[PDB]
């Protein structure tokens with residue numbers, strides 16, 4: 001029932017994601033010189049260094065907000081990909097599966113702790 005535990009749990013999951021080779025295209029903002037039309041397709045860029053920075057600055061109130069930004073990294077890749085078989089999109093699906101498998105308990109424990117707090 002620790003209401004603050006999610007933060008270190010998210011920091012550790014971000015460390016795992018950064019050690020994963022599949023995260024490389026998503027570690028920093030998409031380079032507009034490499035993908036000139038990126039902002040014509042994507043309205044809200046997102047990347048793992050921005051998520052880590054937001055977390056470390058104390059600018060996420062809950063793991064749900066962090067989860068929303070991580071899911072936006074994956075939906076941006078899906079929207080930008082020219083093919084469902086592209087290399088970078090294929091990496092995003094594996095990384096998404098790994099992130100969802102690990103964030104599930106973080107979200108569950110946080111919501112349970114918050115419900116206990118207002119019991």
Ligand SMILES: CN(C)C(=O)c1cn[nH]c1
Nearest residue numbers: 025077080081086088089
């Ligand atoms: C990060 N990035 C450039 C992408 O998500 C992408 C998706 N398909 N091709 C490139």
